[PDB]
C-alpha cells in the first residue's frame, strides 16, 4: 500500500539531505579560536519555594522573572533586590510550566490539569485574580509562550498544540502532526514560526498564521525534553534523554552540531542560548549544568552548586545573567 | 539609605514571605498520595466512600481527614497511555497506592509488569508503594467455582505451598488463601528484587466494601513518616 510510498519519500528526503550536505559545522568553523574556560559566579540566590520548581521565564525588562513550583504558587522575583513582588496562589498544585507576557501584564500557567490559567498582574485593586481559563485539551500542558497580549500558543501532552485567543477563549489553530507528547516549544523572534519537540524523537516546525507543518527533524534517539530557538531565528538546539544535544537549521534542513560527552549518561532537561548564541547552556540529571561552545562542541563551563536535579534555565534578553531553577526549591542567578 | 519605594518593596516582600510561611505550615501539615491502577482495578470505589469540574479534567483530587491528619489523594484523569513523562511530577509524594485486581488472571501478570514500572523507575525508586489487592470476594468466588485454573497462566502456582507466617481468615477456603498468598509472594519478589532498604511495599487485602483501608493507609503513612525522620537524624 502507501507504506512503500512513505518509505520511498523518506528515502528521497534523506538522499536530498545527504546531497545538500557538503561539510560539517565543526570542520568549517575549526579555524577559529576556542572560548576557553567559562567561570560564572552566583550573584543572587532566591529562597522561599516549597516544592520542586519546574519552569521559569524572564521578562522583557530583564528585571522581574516568574517562577513556578509544584506547591501551587507562582512567585514574581526581582533579579536585582531579590524581593518578592507577587505571589499568585494556584488552584492546582501539580503545575509544569509558566509564561510571562511581553508587556508584563499577564502571566500564564498550566500542568497536569487540562486548563491553562492566565492571571492579570495589572488589576485595579493591586492584587492578582483569575483573568482567563482556557480549557479543551486532553493532555497535560508541558510548555506555553506568549506571542502578544491577546494570543498565546500552548503545547499539551495529547500530541497536539493549540493557539488560543485571550479575548475569545477558543482554539484558533490546532496542530495535530506530532506523534508523541510535545514537551517544549520556542517562538521565533518575529513570532511567525515556532519549533516544537515531542516524545517521538522528532521536532516539527509550525506556522502561526498558516497552521501547517513546515519541516521535521528527528535527529535524536530518545524523547526530546526541551528546545530553544537561536537568537538569529534560523536555528534551534534540542536536548533529549540520550545525553546528546543537537543543533538543527530550518534553512539547511539537517543536523549542524552534536554536543555530548562520554562521562555524561544523563538526559537534558532544559536548554537556552545567550544573546550572541556562542554559548549553549544545558541542565542535566547529574545535579549540574553545562555550558558548551555552540561552534566548537567543547565543555566551556560547569555551573555546579545545585543540590537536586536541574529543571529549568533562563537567559535574559540582554544576556547579562542566567537563572537556573532546580528541584531543590531554589533559583540561582549566575553571571 | 533606601528610598520610600524600596521600603514599600521590602514591606511587600516581607508580607509575601509571611504568606508563604503560612501556606507552608498547611502544606507540611497535609500529606499527598498518588492513586494508580488499571481500569478494572476499582479506583472509582476507593475514590468514593469518603467519610472524611470540566469534562476533560486530567487530574482529580480527593481530600479526607483521618485522626486529625489531612490526606489529599491525586488520581490521573484524561491522560493518554503514555505515563513516563508526567509521573515524574509525583517524585515528591508520600506514597503511591497501587490497585491490582485479584480475580482477573489474564491481566494480573500485566499488572505485575506495571508494578515493575512503579518499582524499578529511576524517579520512583525512593517512594513507598501500598499494594491494594482489590476484589477479594470475586477471587474467592472464582476459586470456589473451579472453572478457571491458575496453572493456565502461572505454572509455578502448581509448585507453591502456604507460607508458615500465613494468617488465614476465619471462614475462608484453603484454596483462596493459597492463591492470595501466591499472588502476594509474586508481588513481593518483584518488589524486593530492587528494594535494597530505600523503599518497601505495603501489602493490604481489599474487598468490595472496606471502610478501614484508609485508616490502614494512615498507619502506613505514619510508618513512612518515621522512615523519613530516622534517616535525617542519623539512626537508620
Amino acid at each position: 500500500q502507501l507504506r512503500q510510498e512513505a518509505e520511498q519519500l523518506k528515502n528521497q528526503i534523506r538522499d536530498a539531505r545527504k546531497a545538500c550536505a557538503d561539510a560539517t559545522l565543526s570542520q568549517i568553523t575549526n579555524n577559529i579560536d576556542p572560548v576557553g574556560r567559562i567561570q560564572m559566579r552566583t550573584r543572587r540566590t532566591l529562597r522561599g519555594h516549597l516544592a520542586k520548581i519546574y519552569a521559569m521565564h524572564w521578562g522583557t525588562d530583564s528585571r522581574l522573572l516568574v517562577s513556578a513550583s509544584q506547591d501551587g504558587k507562582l512567585i514574581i522575583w526581582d533579579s536585582y533586590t531579590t524581593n518578592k513582588v507577587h505571589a499568585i496562589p494556584l488552584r492546582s498544585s501539580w503545575v509544569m510550566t509558566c509564561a510571562y507576557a511581553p508587556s508584563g501584564n499577564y502571566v500564564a500557567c498550566g500542568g497536569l490539569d487540562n486548563i491553562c490559567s492566565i492571571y492579570n498582574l495589572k488589576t485595579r485593586e493591586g492584587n492578582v485574580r483569575v483573568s482567563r481559563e482556557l480549557a479543551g485539551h486532553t493532555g497535560y500542558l508541558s510548555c506555553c509562550r506568549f506571542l502578544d497580549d491577546n494570543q498565546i500558543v500552548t503545547s499539551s501532552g495529547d500530541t497536539t498544540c493549540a493557539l488560543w485567543d485571550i479575548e475569545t477563549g477558543q482554539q484558533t489553530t490546532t496542530f495535530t502532526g506530532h506523534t508523541g507528547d510535545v514537551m517544549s516549544l520556542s517562538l521565533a523572534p518575529d513570532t511567525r514560526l515556532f519549533v516544537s519537540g515531542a516524545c517521538d524523537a522528532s521536532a516539527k516546525l509550525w506556522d502561526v498564521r498558516e497552521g501547517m507543518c513546515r519541516q521535521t527533524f528527528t535527529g535524536h534517539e530518545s524523547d526530546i525534553n526541551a528546545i530553544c530557538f537561536f537568537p538569529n531565528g534560523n536555528a534551534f538546539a534540542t536536548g533529549s534523554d540520550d545525553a546528546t544535544c543537537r543543533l538543527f537549521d530550518l534553512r539547511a534542513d539537517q543536523e549542524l552540531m552534536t554536543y555530548s560527552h562520554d562521562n555524561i549518561i544523563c538526559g537534558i532537561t532544559s536548554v537556552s542560548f545567550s544573546k550572541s548564541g556562542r554559548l549553549l547552556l544545558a541542565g542535566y540529571d547529574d545535579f549540574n549544568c553545562n555550558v558548551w561552545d555552540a561552534l566548537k562542541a567543547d565543555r566551556a563551563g560547569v555551573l555546579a552548586g545545585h543540590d537536586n536535579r536541574v529543571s529549568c534555565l533562563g537567559v535574559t534578553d540582554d544576556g547579562m545573567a542566567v537563572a537556573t531553577g532546580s528541584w531543590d526549591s531554589f533559583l540561582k542567578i549566575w553571571n | 539609605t533606601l528610598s520610600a519605594e524600596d521600603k514599600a518593596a521590602v514591606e511587600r516582600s516581607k508580607m509575601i514571605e509571611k504568606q508563604l510561611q503560612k501556606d507552608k505550615q498547611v502544606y507540611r501539615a497535609t500529606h499527598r498520595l498518588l492513586l494508580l491502577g488499571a481500569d478494572n482495578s476499582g479506583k472509582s470505589t476507593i475514590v468514593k466512600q469518603m467519610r472524611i469540574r470540566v469534562k476533560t479534567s486530567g487530574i482529580f483530587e480527593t481530600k479526607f481527614q483521618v485522626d486529625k491528619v489531612n490526606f489529599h489523594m491525586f488520581d490521573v484523569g484524561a491522560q493518554r497511555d503514555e505515563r513516563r513523562k508526567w509521573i515524574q511530577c509525583f517524585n515528591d509524594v508520600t506514597a503511591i497506592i497501587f490497585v491490582v485486581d485479584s480475580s482477573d488472571y489474564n491481566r494480573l501478570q500485566e499488572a505485575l509488569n506495571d508494578f515493575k514500572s512503579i518499582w524499578n523507575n529511576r524517579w520512583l525508586r525512593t517512594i513507598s508503594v501500598i499494594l491494594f489487592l482489590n476484589k477479594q470476594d470475586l477471587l474467592a468466588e472464582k476459586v470456589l467455582a473451579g472453572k478457571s485454573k491458575i496453572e493456565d497462566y502461572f505454572p509455578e502456582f502448581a509448585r507453591y505451598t502456604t507460607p508458615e507466617d500465613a494468617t488465614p481468615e476465619p471462614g475462608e477456603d484453603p484454596r483462596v488463601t493459597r492463591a492470595k498468598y501466591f499472588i502476594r509472594d509474586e508481588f513481593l519478589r518483584i518488589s524486593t528484587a530492587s528494594g535494597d532498604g530505600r523503599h518497601y511495599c505495603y501489602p493490604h487485602f481489599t474487598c468490595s466494601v472496606d471502610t478501614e483501608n484508609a485508616r490502614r493507609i494512615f498507619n502506613d503513612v505514619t510508618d513512612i513518616i518515621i522512615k523519613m525522620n530516622l534517616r535525617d537524624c542519623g539512626l537508620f
Partner: nanobody
Amino acid sequence: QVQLQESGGGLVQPGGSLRLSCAASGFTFSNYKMNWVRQAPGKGLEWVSDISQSGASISYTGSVKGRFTISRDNAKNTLYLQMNSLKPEDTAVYYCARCPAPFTRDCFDVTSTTYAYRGQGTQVT
C-alpha cells in the same frame, strides 16, 4: 530515524518452531533495553519477554516461560527470539519495544498503544 524491522513469521502447524529476527537502525542497540510483546486478535497488547543491554537480566512471562528464548547480537545489532513448541493460542502479532531512556532499567510505555520506538510487527500463526 529510529526504525525496527521484524521478520521470521509465517504459517506454522501447532508444535513447530520459529526464529524471529528484529533489526534496529538509527540508535545504539547495545545501550538500550529491549522487549518483545504480543497482540492477539480481539485482545490487547501483552508483554512476552525482556532483555537488558548486556543480556545479563533476561525475563519471560509466565505464559511462555520455558519455551521461548530471547538473545541479542551487538555485532549485528539484531534481536533474536527462538520460539519452540508453538500453541494455537500463541497466534499473535509480535512487536519489539525499546526503552525510552538509555542506561536505565524501567520499561515504561512498552505496552502503550501508540509507541514510536516500536516496529510494525509481523504476522505469526
